[PDB]
Structures are given as C-alpha cells and as structure tokens.
Amino acid sequence: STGSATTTPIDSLDDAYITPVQIGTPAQTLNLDFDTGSSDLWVFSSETTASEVDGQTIYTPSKSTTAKLLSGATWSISYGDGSSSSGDVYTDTVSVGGLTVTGQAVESAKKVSSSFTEDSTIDGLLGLAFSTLNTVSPTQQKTFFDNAKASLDSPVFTADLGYHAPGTYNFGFIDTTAYTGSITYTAVSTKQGFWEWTSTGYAVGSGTFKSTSIDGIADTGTTLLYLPATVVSAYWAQVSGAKSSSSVGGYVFPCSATLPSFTFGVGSARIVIPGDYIDFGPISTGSSSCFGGIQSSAGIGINIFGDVALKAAFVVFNGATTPTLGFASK
Ligand SMILES: O[C@@H]1CNC[C@@H]1Oc1ccccc1
Ligand SMILES: O[C@@H]1CNC[C@@H]1Oc1ccccc1
C-alpha cells in the first residue's frame, strides 16, 4: 500500500504545517501537525476541558463505531518549547492520504497547555519519530508509521515541505518527479528515539564550506534551524545590524536587510537554504526588527534541523531495519 497527503502552512510565516487525517467510522477529519521529533498521535477531543478548546476541530470517540477505550492507558507529553498535553487513549481506524491503519492508538486530550488552545489551526499532532519515545503508560504504543510499515510497498515516508506554499507527505514510495539530482543517504542513530544524523558542515552565503561534524535531528515539528552558537554567530555576522537579544529570545535583524543563504552538508552533497527562508518577519506587528530563522541550540541540548532546513530539500525517512535519512535538492 501507499498514501499521499498534502501538507499546508498554517500561516504566512510557515510557523507549522497541517495535514488532514481521517479518524473513526464514519470519518472525522482533523488537521494534524506531523512531527518527526515526537511519537504520540494526540487530538483535541470531546474530553478536552471546555475552556481549553478555542476553534479546534475535536474527535468524539462516542460517535465512532470503531473506537474502543484502551482501558487504563494514559499519556502525558512536554515538548521542547514548554508546551504540553495529557489524557486517555482509544484505539480507532486512522487514514492518511488513502493509507489506512486499524487499531491505531489515538490519544485523547483531557488537558492542553495555553499555547495549544491559542492556536486554532492545529487539531493535534501525529508523531513520526521512533515508537520508543511514545508516552502511553503502562503499555507503550506504536506510531502510525510503525503500524503501517509492514503493509507499505517500501518501509519509508517522505517530507516535501513548501516555502510559503503547500507540500506533500508520502508513505510507502519515493516520488522520483519531486526532486532534482540524486538523493544522498546518511546514517541515523535511534539511540535517543529521534531521526538523529550528522551533517558534514556548513557555508554562509557565497563563503567557503567549513567541514565539521554537526549532530542533530530531522524534526518537522520544529519551525526553525537550531545549531551550535559558533555556527549561528558566523551566520549573523554577515547581516549588518543583526544581534542576539535576550529580551526577544534570539537573534533579530533589521527588516530592511537582504539575508544570505545557508548551506548544510549531507555527506559530500550540499543543501542550500535561500536567505528568504530565514526571515520570520517583525517581532511584533509594525516593528522594524525581524526574527531570525537560524538560532542557537545552546540552551536545548541537541541541534535541530527544523522546517527552515527541511523545506529546502526532499527528505526520505527510511525505516528499514537499519534506518537512514536521504536528502535531495528540489
Ligand atoms: O506554539 C504553537 C501553538 N501551539 C503549540 C505550537 O507549537 C508546537 C507545535 C508542535 C509541537 C509542540 C509545539
Ligand atoms: O496560530 C498562531 C498563528 N501564528 C502563531 C500561532 O501558531 C503557531 C506559532 C508558532 C509555531 C506554531 C504555531
């Protein structure tokens, strides 16, 4: 089998991407944030505290003839930005772009943090990291990809995110029309449960390429590119007036600037992030200070190749027995 679904930016900045997902019988369609950095499929629901729902579409298990309570199971998650959610668990039929999994754990939120309530465009998350990170207790549950894998034509999914435009998530096949050149594959460590890999270096603008190993994760659920402070300083030093602001929480730059590109290495290959992809706009409405799309990872504990980087490539998440990542230009 295969599946193919369109993913759409939630706003004019590409802050996140939403993909429609069918849950239950008859189908209830929710717009989920596909997150290769976590491993829980959770949704706003009829069980969510009413004061914490503000515009989201909810899953109602009592209206699904295929929903079954997973008795005794609970879940609770906190993300890298401090957002969180928790609740109980049902199994139900879940379909993405024509690909159907029966018996998928659908984690129903009883509580969500204010950051989720305040974003009416995201109805929940669909995790695509390794199932060892799933938070369901006392019986850990499998991701949608892990459940689907054996049925897929090939044990892979691909992320093709657009810049200010829709893109695609495919399951079970490589669309050879969706990229240019060849795909370069690189090794993955699953030791922390992430799609963790080692970039071979970077360049700023037209500058020379610096060969240096940068360990990090391919994370579709993170907006920005988070890298070591040395690398990030070298980038922003090429933008007149750019500075790190403690009050704002990162590097800012004059909105009048033209930003240089940023290149990262994948083996001997190179992915070029255009400068425009690094512009996240005024820090507040009407400000002439703009927020940068490359930020320091120093406070996180891991480097994160988030959407800023991934949207510059066609990315293969190869879930074969020895997992690998592939990157191509597009
Ligand atoms: O802050 C934004 C609005 N609600 C939270 C959202 O960011 C996240 C998206 C996915 C995972 C964690 C956080
Ligand atoms: O819904 C609102 C529109 N822009 C802000 C908020 O959502 C998000 C902000 C940051 C990351 C993910 C989502």
UniProtKB/Swiss-Prot annotation:
Catalytic residues (positions): 35, 199
Source organism: Cryphonectria parasitica (Chestnut blight fungus)
UniProt superkingdom: Eukaryota
UniProt family annotation: Belongs to the peptidase A1 family.
Lineage: Eukaryota, Fungi, Dikarya, Ascomycota, Pezizomycotina
The Peptidase A1 domain, residue ranges: 17-328
First-level EC class: hydrolase
GO molecular function: aspartic-type endopeptidase activity
GO biological process terms, semicolon-separated: proteolysis
Catalytic activity: Hydrolysis of proteins with specificity similar to that of pepsin A, prefers hydrophobic residues at P1 and P1', but does not cleave 14-Ala-|-Leu-15 in the B chain of insulin or Z-Glu-Tyr. Clots milk
Primary gene name: EAPA
Keywords associated with the record: Aspartyl protease, Disulfide bond, Hydrolase, Protease, Signal, Zymogen
Annotated disulfide bonds: 255-290
The protein's name: Endothiapepsin
Documented EC number(s): 3.4.23.22
